[PDB]
Amino acid sequence: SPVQTLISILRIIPDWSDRTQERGMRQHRTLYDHEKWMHHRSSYRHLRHLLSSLSSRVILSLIPPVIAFTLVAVVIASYNTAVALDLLPGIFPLLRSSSLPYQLTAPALALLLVFRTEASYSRFEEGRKSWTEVIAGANDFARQIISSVETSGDAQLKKALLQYIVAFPVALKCHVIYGSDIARDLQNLLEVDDLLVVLNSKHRPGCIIQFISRSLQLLKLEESRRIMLQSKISCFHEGIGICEQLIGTPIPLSYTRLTSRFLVLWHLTLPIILWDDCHWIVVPATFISAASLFCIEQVGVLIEEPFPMLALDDLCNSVRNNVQEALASEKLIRARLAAKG
Amino acid sequence: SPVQTLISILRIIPDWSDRTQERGMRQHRTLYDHEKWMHHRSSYRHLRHLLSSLSSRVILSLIPPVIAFTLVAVVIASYNTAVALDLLPGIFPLLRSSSLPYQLTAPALALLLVFRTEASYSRFEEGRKSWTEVIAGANDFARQIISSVETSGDAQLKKALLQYIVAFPVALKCHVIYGSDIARDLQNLLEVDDLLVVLNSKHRPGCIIQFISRSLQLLKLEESRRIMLQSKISCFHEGIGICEQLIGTPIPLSYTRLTSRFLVLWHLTLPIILWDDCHWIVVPATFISAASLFCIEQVGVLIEEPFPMLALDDLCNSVRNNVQEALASEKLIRARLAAKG
Amino acid sequence: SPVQTLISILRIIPDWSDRTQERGMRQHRTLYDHEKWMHHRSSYRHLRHLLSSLSSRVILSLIPPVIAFTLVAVVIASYNTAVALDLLPGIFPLLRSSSLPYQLTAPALALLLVFRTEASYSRFEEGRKSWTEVIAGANDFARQIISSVETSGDAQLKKALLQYIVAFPVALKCHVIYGSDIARDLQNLLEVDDLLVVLNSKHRPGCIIQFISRSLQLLKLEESRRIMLQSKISCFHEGIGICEQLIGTPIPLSYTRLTSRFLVLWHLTLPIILWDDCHWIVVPATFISAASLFCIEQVGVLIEEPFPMLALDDLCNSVRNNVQEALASEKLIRARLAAKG
Amino acid sequence: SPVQTLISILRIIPDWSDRTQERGMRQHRTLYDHEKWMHHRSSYRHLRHLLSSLSSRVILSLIPPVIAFTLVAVVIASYNTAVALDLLPGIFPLLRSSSLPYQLTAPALALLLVFRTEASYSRFEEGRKSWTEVIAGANDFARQIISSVETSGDAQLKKALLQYIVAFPVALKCHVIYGSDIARDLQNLLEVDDLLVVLNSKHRPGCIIQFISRSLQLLKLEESRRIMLQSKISCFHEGIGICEQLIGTPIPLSYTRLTSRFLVLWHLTLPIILWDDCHWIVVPATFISAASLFCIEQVGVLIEEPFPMLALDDLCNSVRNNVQEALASEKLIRARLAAKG
Amino acid sequence: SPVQTLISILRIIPDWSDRTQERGMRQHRTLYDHEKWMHHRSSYRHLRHLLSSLSSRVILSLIPPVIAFTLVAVVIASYNTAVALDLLPGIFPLLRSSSLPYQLTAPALALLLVFRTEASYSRFEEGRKSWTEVIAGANDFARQIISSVETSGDAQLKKALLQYIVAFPVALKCHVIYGSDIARDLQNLLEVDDLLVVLNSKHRPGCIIQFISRSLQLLKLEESRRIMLQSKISCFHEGIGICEQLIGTPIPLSYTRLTSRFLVLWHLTLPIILWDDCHWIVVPATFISAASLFCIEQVGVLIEEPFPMLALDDLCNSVRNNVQEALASEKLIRARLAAKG
């Protein structure tokens, strides 16, 4: 009760920040087109990024660490002022230091921070490339199935097989994104009895891969054609592997706890070394330093698991859009080439 | 009317800058040859880059942010001068600070700026490599079709198939470049009825891939030869995938808004920390700092979507030039090897 | 006895640190799920990393080098104080220097330290990717064996072959991790006579690869199917090769001894150059500098051989979990596709 | 005449520098062997690099920009001296400034310069790897042709085909190097009528690829063997693609004009900020700064198109040397294996 | 005689350093096991690297450049002392300067040095990966030959073919390492008449590749199996290509002479700029700066050609060890799988 009520009050802003950041990660994202790129590289982008700072998910996550160090600066400033006004006994010293130790270690701090954020950006690029390969693989496999499968007796199996290659990116998205309804997202993509088996499996992408591999065995193909055709599933297994490792295995905790601890120690004694040249300007100085330096580390932490920063619904809808345009256009391209003669 | 007329006047230079930069991105680009490389690595390149600065697209895009911070410096300088001349009441302080907080965070700013521009350059290299692979793939596929297809009954289909492999890089260019007339750029490359189906499809590169895949099924080939031959389409699907992701998915907005916000905050208080050592020299100092530092970020923003910085018309014309030289030379190489005996 | 007892006392803290770090490398690690990622990117992560510092394996390994340089600072401070109080003869000078040589070489030290840790992180990413490829390869091979092998006469051999593809990641983990009981970890995965041959071989992963390759020769397959099927073993040979080279071949000893020697020389004379601006504050300054800078190098040394920082038991159990879900679901997917007709 | 004669005199040193650098790019280069590596890592390498500075191609290209900024420093110094001696009217001020703006932007300049040179080095490594792949591909293709082709009726065609695989790296070198006589370099490698068709083609590497592909169609091979054999031409198409893109597409002109303009602005006002601490030492200081900083950018510009920095004649002669050693040794290896029995 | 005897005395320490470094590159290296990794990441590694500094090959190579700059500092200090004591005429000035030009260029020097050493480390990683691929390729090829070749009539040829795949890594090691006895290292690996042909060839790795390719043509295999089997030689051609290019083509001499010349100019005038703050402490300051900064460049120069820093004998013996364990275990795995039934 006496000390428990103090911790509960201090546990309000960080709880609000955690709720705000996590709700901001469920936001729907969209593929950039040309007119959105024009808006991106505009003269007003510097004004509009500054005025949208208070609604930014990254800025609102800095509120706990920036407030924490600003009160540390205010307490150091208050104590140093009390010593300067002789309001405390002579035994109490003035908390001041030379900036020279910090001038020797500043480049070490900057290189650690920016390299940690570069490691996070590398894992985002790995995610983006893996999804590029899965979507190009599904497009390539669907294109080849539309051309390869010809027999009138395999029409139902060909239709089923084209439904699973569209459904695989959706299942993989529902595997990598938290709180995703695969049943709703596959309702119009798989058959009612088709989807029941998929919903009953622990590994939904793997299960759909299994339906793909068994359809290729029941098709009436020459063995060379089937071997060529079942070589395209390895793309899906590779995609599952890369996507599961970015979720399972983060950047080593030693490497990221180093950046965390360095930044916390640097802002704890930053008002002490800055006292001689700044006096009460250590409060705004520590506020701006903590906001700037913790923002780099915050950006690194948010993109370290990158699948929520990708337009995976639009990437998945692109494969579905491509197979319809193709099955509609088949009639026309077939009549056009018949005419060449 | 009273405040609306002020915003309209302030919305003139950024509108002019946005119009100038966007018109400069439609410029026709050309592949470097040897004598253009000699001009590139000349002693006069430092003079000619400086004298062509006022016509540079990047420099004219810096005019809004550089003017904005130069008037901030002029207002801070005017206020500090009024305090120094005792033209304001004693309550009004002098806006001055120590440079020591900025000396600790300078390397963090420099590393963030230069790493952001390096991320943009990485996406340009990804674009350039993808186009390298698509053009080498189209050259390789065309070379193999000229050698593989022999039957006199497949001459029309072979000619048609060589027309689509030339047309695929042009369709992909017209997919990635804004305001591109595919109908005009494919007028002499595809047949009149051939192009109508392509113009009616939502995915023109995909449609041409579909015409390629169906021609390979109607060719009278051995199945091993056809499987070898239809393995070269995967290059085109990979090219489409990489090109669509560089347009759809930019560098995460957190990562680039960080660099934007850092630079805006750094130049807002830069005249305050520089006042003690510079006085009215904060105006030229802030002008040069804003011009130098915003130019790095501007270069990063312009090459982030890189397909307008590539000579995609010359890369596409190279594939067309190669297939003619080949179909002309076929007669000669065939007679030369017949003679070996 | 007189000097041997002094070395034994000085050999206590480093022995304790070496025991603590090595016991901390046998810790069981777990794949991150979604709610563990939420905990990772929390507002409290800066507080909880600081309060868990005294139990951190990296921090307890810094105790020997941080104590060593803190007593060096205390001895330099004591000597300089004795000179300032004229307690020593006039011949004895004051150990002071200018910081200007250190201000010119600080960025060289920071770039060396952070690049060494980046080299270590690159070897961790190489390890993580190699295990990604091995697990995706085993999943892909198992999926294809479940579909490819059909003959009722090859049921026993198919079951045996699926047991070795699950067992290969476990043997490779027991090859790369020290003090690993392969006999206990393969007790329920291979047959009793199957495991005796594996336990008698010097290269257990290689031996299991050999059982896989011989099963593929005894299967009643068409030669094209078998060639397609025995192309998936190359993944396992590549995995063995990459995993053995990260253990056998460290980062060149020149490159890492450079960072070691630089840091030792920099902290030996750091209290001498800092004396004029700090006086007795060289003790806390050297303590914090040694703790910060040796922590970067320590993080680099711990992840340089990275296989203990990976959840290799969970990655291995995922392949076993996937093949059961598959052999259970086979009955259902077969009845579902039979029904398409 | 009055102003034209001044520009002609100022256009002498840059013309001489451009002539010297361009003649130095036609120099014959040689593959390092072991005793040249011993000379490379010698104790005297620091003395011999300094004494060979005046004959260095990079140093003689710095003469125009280093002289230009040294006279700027001399003019600023002369003007500041005239003000200090009161030789000009009181209205004329002293051109001095604080170094603090330059101390905040120094790391930005250094990171831009060194990253630009790293981009140039990346394009050199891309060139070197592409030539590695082409030479290994030609060696691999020649080795397989010597083993695969057996029929006594295909001896003439086999000899012809081995002549084109040796000739392809020479044609690609003559495609990428300026002023290269392909007729002289292929005189002893192709037949007299063979070379006439190659000389008449606009794309000589492509033409030789076409002679290779047509020889493989006229060989009496099984179709599986021919498909295996014509899969090795893709290496040559990839080599042509990568080599043409490094010549056609430089590093984006925005990115390199940034480094150019930054360096020119930094050395223009460098004597003004250095006046208070240096006085006439701004002339040697600006001379050394311009020589050091423009040398980094110069190195970047010279290796940006890297094919003249490679020993392409020695790499091409290695493939020719390997096929002779092989066709000579064939008799011996055939008799050795016949004897195994 | 008068000036020749002075150069001979100055040519003693660099000759001794060159002899010591070159003898230290022939040292036998060993693959790290687990207990050597424990020794690597110990608390005593900072003490044991410092006490083994005088026997370090890199440190003894710094003796010529560190002594050279320390006498430069001593001469500058002696001259400045003579001026301060008025022992020279008034015309002779005091060699002093401001450190501000060096404070602006320090980060440029540090980034150049550390990036040059990173380029050297990249070439070491390329070498290490190439050897990883060659050893995994030889293991994979040997494993497949043991399974694929079955005919009792091909036992002698199968034994011969397994002897050449073990011998290829040894020949490639004897190709890349200077002063290597291939005759002694292949004495127990090839037949007496087998080795005579290999010793008579100019390209020993190529010759062994030729014996491998001819054995595959004389084996009684199905053509699909042989094509699968002769696809594994491309690994050996790739290995030869990458290994020959790292020896033939160093890092461009412009790029490394830049770092050399920068470091020599920086330490020549370093005692002049440090005189005002250090006086005779420029001698130890220049000694430590030259030792630290030239050590980074020295590490870069020693690993630039990396094949002596690899345990190539242990990597080669691992392939030989693996094929014996396999040919011994064949009997057992064959009886085990026969029993499954």
Resolution (A): 2.7
- Return residues 13-32 of D near B (CB < 8 Å): 13-15, 17-18, 21-22
Give the separation between CA B23 and CA B25, rounded to whole angstroms.
5
Give the separation between CA A145 and CA B237, rounded to whole angstroms.
14
Give the separation between CA C122 and CA C108, rounded to whole angstroms.
21
Q: What value does the CA radius of gyration of chain C take, rounded to a whole number of Å?
A: 29
Among B41, B50, B315, beta carbon nearest to D301? B41
Report which of E167, E173, E180, E248 is spatially closest to residue E208, judged by C-alpha positions.
Answer: E167
Domain-embedded: residue C112? no
The total of other beta-carbon atoms located within 10 Å of residue A4's CB is: 7
Contact A104 C106 (CB under 8 A): yes
Tokens of E228: 């699968």
Cβ–Cβ under 8 Å, residues C282 and C75:
no
Helix (H) / strand (E) element for A82: namely: helix A63-84
Contact E197 D128 (CB under 8 A): no
Tokens of C125: 């990413």
Cβ–Cβ under 8 Å, residues E138 and E163:
no
Smallest CA–CA distance, residue A95 to chain C, in Å, is 11
Which residue on chain C is closest to A59 by alpha carbon? Answer: C43
Cβ–Cβ under 8 Å, residues B137 and B239:
yes
Neighbors of chain C with 3 or more C-beta pairs under 8 Å? A, E
Cβ–Cβ under 8 Å, residues A186 and A171:
yes
Q: What angle do CA D257, D263, D266 make, to 5 degrees?
A: 135
Among C46, C102, C110, beta carbon nearest to A260? C46
Give the separation between CA B138 and CA A131, rounded to whole angstroms.
24
Among A202, A231, A305, beta carbon nearest to C325? A202
Give the separation between CA A43 and CA E232, rounded to whole angstroms.
56
Contact B337 D160 (CB under 8 A): yes
Give the separation between CA C146 and CA A213, rounded to whole angstroms.
9
Give the separation between CA B83 and CA D53, rounded to whole angstroms.
56
Residues 6+ apart with CB under 8 A from B270: B69, B73, B102, B282, B285, B286, B289
Report which of C210, C101, C197, C218 is spatially closest to residue C154, judged by C-alpha positions.
Answer: C218
- Helices A223-230 & A204-218 angle (0-180, nearest 10): 170
Backbone angles phi, psi at D113, to 5 degrees: -55, -50
Q: How far is CA B264 from CA A47, A54, E2, in A?
A: 9, 15, 68
Give the separation between CA C80 and CA C88, rounded to whole angstroms.
10
Q: Which residue has the tokens 């003869």?
A: C89
Q: How far is CA D158 from CA B150, C89, D144, D162, E82, in A?
A: 22, 93, 11, 6, 82
Give the separation between CA B67 and CA B287, rounded to whole angstroms.
8
Give the separation between CA A298 and CA A296, rounded to whole angstroms.
5
Cβ–Cβ under 8 Å, residues B274 and B282:
yes
Terminal C-alpha separation, chain B:
91
Give the separation between CA D62 and CA D293, rounded to whole angstroms.
10
Domain-embedded: residue C224? yes
Touching check for A257 and chain C: CB below 8 Å? yes
Contact B260 A139 (CB under 8 A): no
Contact A98 C42 (CB under 8 A): no
Secondary structure of residue A220 in the 3-state scheme: coil
Contacts of E303 in chain D (CB under 8 A): none
Residues 6+ apart with CB under 8 A from A119: A251, A255, A300, C121
Give the separation between CA A320 and CA D222, rounded to whole angstroms.
41
Contact B260 A128 (CB under 8 A): no
In angstroms, how far is CA B94 from the centroid of its own chain? 46
Report which of C164, D97, C124 is spatially closest to residue A253, judged by C-alpha positions.
Answer: C124
Domain-embedded: residue E113? no
Report which of B49, B110, B27 is spatially closest to residue D254, judged by C-alpha positions.
Answer: B49
The total of other beta-carbon atoms located within 10 Å of residue B201's CB is: 19
Give the separation between CA E84 and CA E86, rounded to whole angstroms.
6
| Amino acid identity for residue D327 in this structure | L
Q: Which of E72, E199, E214 to mutate to test the interface with D (most CBs of D within 10 A)?
A: E214
Give the separation between CA D294 and CA E70, rounded to whole angstroms.
28
Q: Which of B261, B266, B294, B298 to mutate to test the interface with A (most CBs of A within 10 A)?
A: B261
Cβ–Cβ under 8 Å, residues A141 and C140:
no
Smallest CA–CA distance, residue A84 to chain B, in Å, is 20
For CA atoms E164, E169, E175, E180, the dihedral sign is negative
Q: Which of E18, E100, E224 to mutate to test the interface with D (most CBs of D within 10 A)?
A: E100
**Residues listed for chain D:** 341
Residue B203 maps to which CATH number? Answer: 1.20.1440
Note the helical H segments in chain E.
4-10, 13-23, 34-40, 45-51, 57-61, 63-84, 100-148, 155-176, 182-185, 192-200, 204-218, 223-230, 233-248, 253-278, 282-302, 312-340
In angstroms, how far is CA D205 from the centroid of its own chain? 20
Q: What angle do CA E194, D139, E167 make, to 5 degrees?
A: 30
Domain-embedded: residue A224? yes
The total of other beta-carbon atoms located within 10 Å of residue E5's CB is: 8
Cβ–Cβ under 8 Å, residues E304 and D90:
no
Domain-embedded: residue B164? yes
Contact C18 E42 (CB under 8 A): yes
Q: What value does the CA radius of gyration of chain E take, rounded to a whole number of Å?
A: 29
Q: How far is CA C105 from CA A98, E71, E113, E269, in A?
A: 19, 21, 12, 15
- Return residues 129-188 of A near C (CB < 8 Å): 156-157, 160, 178
Give the separation between CA E341 and CA E155, rounded to whole angstroms.
26
Give the separation between CA C137 and CA D284, rounded to whole angstroms.
63
- Return residues 274-303 of B near A (CB < 8 Å): 294, 301-302
Cβ–Cβ under 8 Å, residues D180 and D174:
yes
Count Cα neighbours of E287 within 13 Å in the Cβ-side half-sphere.
Answer: 10
Residues 6+ apart with CB under 8 A from B275: B76, B77, B80, B94, B95, B96, B97, B282
Give the separation between CA E300 and CA C252, rounded to whole angstroms.
11
Q: Which method was used?
A: cryo-EM
Domain-embedded: residue C167? yes
Give the separation between CA E160 and CA D169, rounded to whole angstroms.
34
Cβ–Cβ under 8 Å, residues D310 and E249:
yes
Give the separation between CA E89 and CA E82, rounded to whole angstroms.
10
Among D22, D238, D249, beta carbon nearest to B128? D249
Cβ–Cβ under 8 Å, residues B188 and B204:
no
For CA atoms D109, D112, D115, D121, the dihedral sign is negative
**Full 3-state SS string of C25-84:** CCCCCCCCCHHHHHHHCCCCHHHHHHHCCCCCHHHHHCHHHHHHHHHHHHHHHHHHHHHH
Report which of C224, E224, D225 is spatially closest to residue A225, judged by C-alpha positions.
Answer: C224
Give the separation between CA D250 and CA D305, rounded to whole angstroms.
8
Helix (H) / strand (E) element for B279: namely: none
Smallest CA–CA distance, residue C3 to chain A, in Å, is 36
Q: Which of C195, C258, C264, C268 to mutate to test the interface with E (most CBs of E within 10 A)?
A: C258
Report which of E106, A115, B268 is spatially closest to residue D106, judged by C-alpha positions.
Answer: E106
Smallest CA–CA distance, residue C45 to chain E, in Å, is 28
Contact B325 D178 (CB under 8 A): no
Contacts of C39-45 spanning 24+ positions with Cβ under 8 A: C40/A250, C40/A301, C40/A304, C41/A21, C41/A301, C41/A302, C41/A304, C42/A14, C42/A18, C43/A13, C43/A14, C43/A15, C43/A17, C43/A18, C43/A61, C43/A64, C43/A65, C44/A14, C44/A64, C45/A260, C45/A301
The total of other beta-carbon atoms located within 10 Å of residue B114's CB is: 20
Secondary structure of residue B24 in the 3-state scheme: coil
The total of other beta-carbon atoms located within 10 Å of residue E133's CB is: 19
For CA atoms C197, C198, C199, C204, the dihedral sign is positive
Contact E108 D296 (CB under 8 A): yes
One-character DSSP codes across E34-83: HHHHHHHT-TTHHHHHHHTSTT-HHHHHTHHHHHHHHHHHHHHHHHHHHH
Report which of B235, B174, B237 is spatially closest to residue A319, judged by C-alpha positions.
Answer: B237
Contact A299 B156 (CB under 8 A): no
Cβ–Cβ under 8 Å, residues E97 and E278:
no
Give the separation between CA D261 and CA D266, rounded to whole angstroms.
8
Contact B240 A136 (CB under 8 A): yes
Q: What value does the CA radius of gyration of chain A take, rounded to a whole number of Å?
A: 29
Among B231, B255, B305, beta carbon nearest to A303? B255
| Amino acid identity for residue A205 in this structure | P
The total of other beta-carbon atoms located within 10 Å of residue B69's CB is: 25
Assign residue A28 a region: left if phi > 0, alpha if psi is -120 to 50, beta otherwise?
beta
Touching check for D229 and chain E: CB below 8 Å? no
Cβ–Cβ under 8 Å, residues C72 and C268:
yes
In angstroms, how far is CA C211 from the centroid of its own chain? 30
Among C34, C148, C277, beta carbon nearest to A100? C277
Which residue on chain D is closest to E101 by alpha carbon? Answer: D285
Count Cα neighbours of E149 within 13 Å in the Cβ-side half-sphere.
Answer: 25
Report which of E327, E331, E337 is spatially closest to residue C191, judged by C-alpha positions.
Answer: E337
Count Cα neighbours of B46 within 13 Å in the Cβ-side half-sphere.
Answer: 26
**D76: exposed, middle or buried (C-beta count within 10 Å: 0-12, 13-18, 19+)?**
buried
Count Cα neighbours of E280 within 13 Å in the Cβ-side half-sphere.
Answer: 4
Touching check for D38 and chain B: CB below 8 Å? no
Contact B143 D230 (CB under 8 A): no
Q: How far is CA B194 from CA A336, B206, B211, C44, D28, in A?
A: 7, 14, 9, 63, 52
Q: What angle do CA A315, A318, A320 make, to 5 degrees?
A: 120
Contact A325 B261 (CB under 8 A): no
Tokens of B111: 């590393």
Residues 6+ apart with CB under 8 A from A300: A116, A117, A119, A120, A256, A259
- Return residues 49-108 of C near A (CB < 8 Å): 49-50, 53, 56-58, 99, 102-103, 106-107
Cβ–Cβ under 8 Å, residues C207 and C235:
no
Secondary structure of residue D143 in the 3-state scheme: helix
Percentages helix, strand, coil for chain D, rounded to the nearest 5?
Answer: 80, 0, 20
Smallest CA–CA distance, residue E49 to chain C, in Å, is 6
Contacts of A337 in chain B (CB under 8 A): 157, 160, 211, 214-215, 218
Smallest CA–CA distance, residue A193 to chain B, in Å, is 31
Cβ–Cβ under 8 Å, residues D251 and D119:
yes
Contact B46 D65 (CB under 8 A): yes
Cβ–Cβ under 8 Å, residues A210 and C329:
yes
Domain-embedded: residue A80? no
Terminal C-alpha separation, chain E:
91
Give the separation between CA A110 and CA A293, rounded to whole angstroms.
9
Touching check for E339 and chain C: CB below 8 Å? yes
Contacts of E134 in chain D (CB under 8 A): none
Contacts of A119 in chain C (CB under 8 A): 121
Report which of C121, C169, C318, C235 is spatially closest to residue A244, judged by C-alpha positions.
Answer: C318
Contact E326 C97 (CB under 8 A): no
Max Cα-Cα span within chain E: 105
Among D64, D105, D206, beta carbon nearest to B322? D206
Smallest CA–CA distance, residue A256 to chain B, in Å, is 17
Q: Which residue has the tokens 């097989």?
A: A161
Tokens of C207: 């031996």
Give the separation between CA E116 and CA E258, rounded to whole angstroms.
10
Give the separation between CA C161 and CA C143, rounded to whole angstroms.
12
Q: How far is CA E316 from CA D105, E30, E187, E235, E241, in A?
A: 52, 12, 14, 16, 18
Max Cα-Cα span within chain C: 105
Cβ–Cβ under 8 Å, residues A135 and B240:
no
Among C110, C122, C238, beta carbon nearest to E136? C238
Residue range of the domain that includes B216? 126-248
Cβ–Cβ under 8 Å, residues E132 and C241:
yes
- Helices D223-230 & E223-230 angle (0-180, nearest 10): 20
Secondary structure of residue D114 in the 3-state scheme: helix
In angstroms, how far is CA E119 from the centroid of its own chain? 13
Q: What is the dihedral of CA D64, D67, D71, D76, to 10 degrees?
A: 100
Contact A207 C124 (CB under 8 A): no
Give the separation between CA D121 and CA D303, rounded to whole angstroms.
7
Among A22, A103, A211, beta carbon nearest to C333? A211
Domain-embedded: residue A241? yes
The total of other beta-carbon atoms located within 10 Å of residue A45's CB is: 19
Count of domains forming chain E: 1
C232-253: buried (b, 16+ CB within 10 Å) or exposed (e) per residue?
Answer: bbbbbbbbbbbbbbbbbbbbbb
